[PDB]
Design a protein. Structure first.
Length: 96
C-alpha cells in the first residue's frame, strides 16, 4: 500500500470510548525526521504529544465527549519528506 508514509486513526467517539492513533514513516529505509501536528481543543498533552513527536502507534481514552479534533502527521525524509492527515472524534452516545 502506502510507500514511506503510514497514517490513520482508530477512535470511536463515546463518553468513555476507545481511542487509538497510528503513524509510521517507512520509505524503503529508516526515516530521518518526523513530528506530529494536531488541532484539538484539548491540546494539553505534553507527555502525549511527546510520544506523538515520534509515536508509530498510540492509544488514547475517549473519557471526554469533547475530544473531537483534526489531527495531522508530518514526516521529512530525503527519500520522502511529506505530510499527513489524521482524525480523532470523541462525543456522547445519542440514545433514542
Amino acid at each position: 500500500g502506502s510507500s514511506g508514509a503510514r497514517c490513520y486513526v482508530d477512535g470511536s467517539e463515546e463518553i468513555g470510548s476507545d481511542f487509538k492513533i497510528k503513524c509510521e514513516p517507512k520509505e524503503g529505509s529508516l526515516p530521518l525526521q518526523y513530528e506530529w501536528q494536531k488541532l484539538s481543543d484539548s491540546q494539553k498533552m505534553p507527555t502525549s504529544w511527546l510520544a506523538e513527536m515520534t509515536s508509530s502507534v498510540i492509544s488514547v481514552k475517549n473519557a471526554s465527549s469533547e475530544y473531537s479534533g483534526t489531527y495531522s502527521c508530518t514526516v521529512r525524509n530525503r527519500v520522502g519528506s511529506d505530510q499527513c492527515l489524521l482524525r480523532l472524534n470523541v462525543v456522547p452516545p445519542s440514545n433514542k
